[PDB]
Amino acid sequence: SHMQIFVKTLTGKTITLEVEPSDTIENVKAKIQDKEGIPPDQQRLIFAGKQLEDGRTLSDYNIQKESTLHLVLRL
Amino acid sequence: MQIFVKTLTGKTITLEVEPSDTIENVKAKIQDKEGIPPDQQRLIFAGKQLEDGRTLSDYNIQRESTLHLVLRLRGG
Amino acid sequence: EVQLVESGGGLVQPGGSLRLSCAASGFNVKTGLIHWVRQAPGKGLEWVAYITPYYGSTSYADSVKGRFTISADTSKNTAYLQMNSLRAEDTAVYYCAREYYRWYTAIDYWGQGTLVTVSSASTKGPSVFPLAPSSKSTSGGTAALGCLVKDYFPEPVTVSWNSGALTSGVHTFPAVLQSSGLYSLSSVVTVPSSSLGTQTYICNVNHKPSNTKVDKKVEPK
Amino acid sequence: TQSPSSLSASVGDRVTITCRASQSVSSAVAWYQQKPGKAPKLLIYSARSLYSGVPSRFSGSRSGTDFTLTISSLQPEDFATYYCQQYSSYSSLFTFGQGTKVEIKRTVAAPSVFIFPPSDEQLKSGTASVVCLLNNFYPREAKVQWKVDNALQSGNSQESVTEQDSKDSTYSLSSTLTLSKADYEKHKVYACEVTHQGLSSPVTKSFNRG
Numbered sequence A: 001s002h003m004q005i006f007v008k009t010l011t012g013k014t015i016t017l018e019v020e021p022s023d024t025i026e027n028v029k030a031k032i033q034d035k036e037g038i039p040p041d042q043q044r045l046i047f048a049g050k051q052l053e054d055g056r057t058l059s060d061y062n063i064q065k066e067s068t069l070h071l072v073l074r075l
Numbered sequence B: 001m002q003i004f005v006k007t008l009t010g011k012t013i014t015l016e017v018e019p020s021d022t023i024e025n026v027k028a029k030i031q032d033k034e035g036i037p038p039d040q041q042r043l044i045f046a047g048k049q050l051e052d053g054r055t056l057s058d059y060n061i062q063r064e065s066t067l068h069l070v071l072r073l074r075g076g
Numbered sequence C: 001e002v003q004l005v006e007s008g009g010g011l012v013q014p015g016g017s018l019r020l021s022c023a024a025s026g027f028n029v030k031t032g033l034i035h036w037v038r039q040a041p042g043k044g045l046e047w048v049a050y051i052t053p054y055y056g057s058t059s060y061a062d063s064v065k066g067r068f069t070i071s072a073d074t075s076k077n078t079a080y081l082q083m084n085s086l087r088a089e090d091t092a093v094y095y096c097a098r099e100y101y102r103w104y105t106a107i108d109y110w111g112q113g114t115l116v117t118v119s120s121a122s123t124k125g126p127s128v129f130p131l132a133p134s135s136k137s138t139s140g141g142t143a144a145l146g147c148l149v150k151d152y153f154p155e156p157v158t159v160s161w162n163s164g165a166l167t168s169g170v171h172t173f174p175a176v177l178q179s180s181g182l183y184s185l186s187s188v189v190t191v192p193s194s195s196l197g198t199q200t201y202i203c204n205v206n207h208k209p210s211n212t213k214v215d216k217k218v219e220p221k
Numbered sequence D: 001t002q003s004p005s006s007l008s009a010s011v012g013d014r015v016t017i018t019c020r021a022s023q024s025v026s027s028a029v030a031w032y033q034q035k036p037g038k039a040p041k042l043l044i045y046s047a048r049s050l051y052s053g054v055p056s057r058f059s060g061s062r063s064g065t066d067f068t069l070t071i072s073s074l075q076p077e078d079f080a081t082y083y084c085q086q087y088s089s090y091s092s093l094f095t096f097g098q099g100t101k102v103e104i105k106r107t108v109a110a111p112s113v114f115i116f117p118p119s120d121e122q123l124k125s126g127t128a129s130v131v132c133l134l135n136n137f138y139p140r141e142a143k144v145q146w147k148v149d150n151a152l153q154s155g156n157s158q159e160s161v162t163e164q165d166s167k168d169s170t171y172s173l174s175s176t177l178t179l180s181k182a183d184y185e186k187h188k189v190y191a192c193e194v195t196h197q198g199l200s201s202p203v204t205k206s207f208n209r210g
Helices: A025-036 B023-034 D181-185
Strands: A003-009 A014-019 A043-047 A068-073 B002-006 B013-016 B041-045 B066-071 C003-007 C010-012 C018-025 C033-039 C045-052 C057-060 C068-073 C078-083 C092-099 C107-110 C114-118 C127-131 C142-152 C158-161 C170-172 C183-192 C202-207 C212-217 D005-009 D015-019 D030-034 D041-045 D058-063 D066-071 D081-087 D094-096 D100-104 D112-116 D127-137 D142-148 D157-161 D171-180 D189-196 D203-208
Touching: A014 A025, A025 A043, B013 B023, B023 B041, C003 C092, C003 C107, C018 C033, C018 C092, C018 C114, C033 C107, C045 C068, C045 C078, C045 C092, C045 D094, C057 C068, C078 C092, C107 D041, C127 C212, C142 C202, C142 D127, C158 C183, C183 D127, C183 D157, C183 D171, D005 D015, D015 D081, D041 D058, D066 D081, D112 D189, D112 D203, D127 D142, D127 D181, D127 D189, D142 D157, D142 D171, D171 D181
Parallel strands: A003 A068, B002 B066, C010 C114, D005 D100
Antiparallel strands: A003 A014, A043 A068, B002 B013, B041 B066, C003 C018, C018 C078, C033 C045, C033 C092, C045 C057, C068 C078, C092 C107, C092 C114, C127 C142, C142 C183, C158 C202, C170 C183, C202 C212, D015 D066, D030 D041, D030 D081, D058 D066, D081 D094, D081 D100, D112 D127, D127 D171, D142 D189, D157 D171, D189 D203
């Protein structure tokens, strides 16, 4: 069932996440909030150079096993 | 320089590259002989996964160094 | 454009064997996996086997494991299903299909399927009998007439009315497997009452597995 | 292994098919739509994401251990059979669930009942088939009982039903009663008795040998 993905900040911090392929971008951010403390309100995730929409899924964007995302914060 | 790419069948393949050659360009070189698109290729060295943006010299790969290849045939 | 074309289907005795072929085009089979999946007439889908052509690794359903051998030939771009120790319950349409990593386990392209029928019964041409229209088969402004296509093996059979002219109001019923182990079906058409006194009616039955071809005129009784 | 189960619905209805699941099996669940005579088509992959070209009225969801297929408002072309597919990482085995056939609900329509005596051609072969036809009825459920000189028959007849007609949403049924010429010749009244929701009481169509 579960996959492992990486989330890279631009501060040079890399966090490892446990996600299902079926997981939604919203749950991902909620998992980021769960262990990191950063609000989903203030998160913006990048994969293959594109921003990921909340209502869609990991699989929507062909995010695979041990793929890497970037996390850009908003103000 | 010369490097070896190792599969999972044990069928190790030879290769020829420069240090300035990108990771993307290496996967394209394996495609030319193996027939597998770069986006289905996962390349490994020293324990690290290799990103399609760095060069060979970035991860500091030398002549006769071994790379490990994982194929994305099943997703999930 | 992607295509999968299966072949090799047909008739076998219980205990016998048969080889299915699955020719692929518009893509290379070594970039993913190929599956066989079968469907018994009137029943659900059943996964059979898969191969990953690039490595040669296989996997098999329980109901099939000790007797089927899936395999691939990369140079021909074809995949095969070698079926041994065949039993009646193996009767089905067999599809091949492919999974590509991007669809996370899901099967995205499927062929139209080939028919494998396993039975001790001998291949046989159908007998065609008229279903005569009459007062016992009219309601209001229309009459029913038909053909009974009886005692044939195996499927399929094709029925056309008046060499293709009559296509409206035709009901060709699904064939039933009789107690004898042979197939029978009905083809009926409803036509206006008053065309029975002017038009002739001829059903055209083609049974390719036995090269039988019958035309039967249906007169009113 | 089995026949699909049937769901009756109207154009515009919301339908939620569920796929019972295990802890062992992976959450990479796929859904297929299959129409009579044709191959299955992929709708949903990875439990809840849309295959290329699938309309938005199709969605997928994870109800804990179980997985669901939802069609928010049913269109005429959505009336078909649906299958879930499961995959286990431990065994590498794939499994398709039972399959659900969604058919079109409409006002109850009684059948037209016709009967056909055996042809002379068949009678000379030493066999006798009587065929009883049920035309354009809804719903699909009907009972056809054969009668020979008012003896109720069983185990000498065969039944077939057509797919729901795509234009008027009715079904047709053909049933054949077969006897030997001899046994046929020893009796007079051959009757087809039909029970259906659209009938006040059973309708009988009969004929006398000859």
